Amino acid sequence: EWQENKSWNAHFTEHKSQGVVVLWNENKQQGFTNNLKRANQAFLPASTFKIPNSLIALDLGVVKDEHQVFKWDGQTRDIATWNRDHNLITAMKYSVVPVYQEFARQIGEARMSKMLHAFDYGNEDISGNVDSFWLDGGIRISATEQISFLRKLYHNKLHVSERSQRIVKQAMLTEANGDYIIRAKTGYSTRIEPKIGWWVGWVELDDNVWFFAMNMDMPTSDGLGLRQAITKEVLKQEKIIP
Numbered sequence: 001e002w003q004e005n006k007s008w009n010a011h012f013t014e015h016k017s018q019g020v021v022v023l024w025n026e027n028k029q030q031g032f033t034n035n036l037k038r039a040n041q042a043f044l045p046a047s048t049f050k051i052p053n054s055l056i057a058l059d060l061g062v063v064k065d066e067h068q069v070f071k072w073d074g075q076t077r078d079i080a081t082w083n084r085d086h087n088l089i090t091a092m093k094y095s096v097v098p099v100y101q102e103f104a105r106q107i108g109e110a111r112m113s114k115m116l117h118a119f120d121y122g123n124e125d126i127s128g129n130v131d132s133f134w135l136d137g138g139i140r141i142s143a144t145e146q147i148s149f150l151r152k153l154y155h156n157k158l159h160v161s162e163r164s165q166r167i168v169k170q171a172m173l174t175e176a177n178g179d180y181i182i183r184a185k186t187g188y189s190t191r192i193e194p195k196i197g198w199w200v201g202w203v204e205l206d207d208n209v210w211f212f213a214m215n216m217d218m219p220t221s222d223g224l225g226l227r228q229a230i231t232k233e234v235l236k237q238e239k240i241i242p
């Protein structure tokens with residue numbers, strides 16, 4: 001069911017980095033990783049938390065639909081793309097933390113905790129501030145746990161409406177061409193050691209789906225592009241994409 005291929009470590013070491021890629025072949029129900037231990041180590045989810053947060057906000061009516069505009073609060077932040085109005089699609093695309101912080105405040109602690117437990121999401125622990133626990137609170141999730149959560153979302157099996165799940169999967173759309181479709185979310189965790197980058201999601205093919213979850217050490221922001229680059233290099237090596 002699980003196979004470890006340590007040769008994939010070269011994809012990280014060649015960039016003077018360390019990390020884990022986890023792949024899951026949905027048709028065969030088989031998983032693959034370069035590091036079984038790190039595949040099951042729990043990290044802060046950071047902006048990968050925008051997936052469950054969106055689901056909950058939609059299902060409770062905090063967000064009406066993917067067109068609703070969240071107005072910029074007029075506070076200049078250091079990420080230029082955050083200093084503007086957003087809807088759910090662009091907020092996911094530009095990982096707009098302050099929009100999702102307001103979602104969490106409107107959800108509130110009790111409902112957030114209850115929903116994460118319903119989702120079986122990571123350690124299901126929201127200790128910390130309700131508007132930042134996924135950045136510097138107690139919540140943790142592993143790469144294999146990301147796969148488990150994403151498989152439920154793909155199959156519309158989470159305990160929210162089908163509509164909420166379809167909308168979030170629309171918002172996860174990252175890349176599409178004649179060969180494949182990628183639905184995914186990046187993450188970047190800096191407030192708690194070790195600093196890491198995430199990329200989690202799946203690749204849709206004509207006749208199969210491959211789920212993936214990766215994290216890697218990220219001592220500075222200069223390496224952020226390696227999150228997708230390394231993942232796609234593994235996918236190409238494994239003949240999942242050309």
Ligand SMILES: Cc1cccc(-c2cccc(C(=O)O)c2)c1
Pocket residue numbers: 079094095096186188221224
């Ligand atoms: C340098 C820095 C610091 C804090 C957040 C980010 C950021 C902001 C928005 C998107 C991304 C990203 O990777 O997709 C990264 C960058």
